[PDB]
């Protein structure tokens, strides 16, 4: 609801899911200044083919990874994605073959399901 810059409204590809809330990946919390403490957000469905294209090409999240202001990235990692990555990449971490595979195999979902 409060918009201070253009990245406060972006276009997303819908996916239908059973539970009542709107849900998005927490990397996109920083543009919206959202904090999941009973926050509410608005949704608009463009009713025209020309309004889809302008939404998709100009307002898509992948086209808006950097703020217009200083040209710095706003969609990036956040808490528990920085701490987990930090503890993973420390020099003390060593994995055997069974736990290497079980961490890597998590990525094999969605469009990565076909890759070797």
């Amino acid at each position: 609801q409060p918009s201070l810059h253009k990245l406060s409204i972006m276009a997303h590809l819908a996916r239908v899911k059973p539970h009542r809330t709107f849900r998005f990946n927490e990397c996109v919390c920083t543009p919206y200044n959202a904090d999941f403490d009973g926050d509410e957000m608005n949704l608009h469905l463009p009713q025209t083919e020309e309004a889809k294209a302008e939404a998709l090409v100009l307002m898509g999240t992948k086209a808006n990874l950097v703020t217009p202001r200083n040209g710095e990235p706003l969609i990036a990692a956040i808490q528990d994605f920085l701490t987990g990555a930090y503890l993973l990449t420390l020099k003390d971490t060593f994995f055997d073959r069974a736990k290497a595979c079980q961490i890597i195999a998590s990525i094999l979902v969605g469009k990565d399901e076909k890759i070797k």
Partner: peptide, 17 residues
């Protein structure tokens, strides 16, 4: 330009639809 791509796709999609 990005604006040109958005309009060309939008008109083409309406024409295809």
């Amino acid at each position: 330009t990005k604006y040109e791509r958005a309009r060309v796709l939008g008109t083409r999609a309406l024409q295809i639809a």
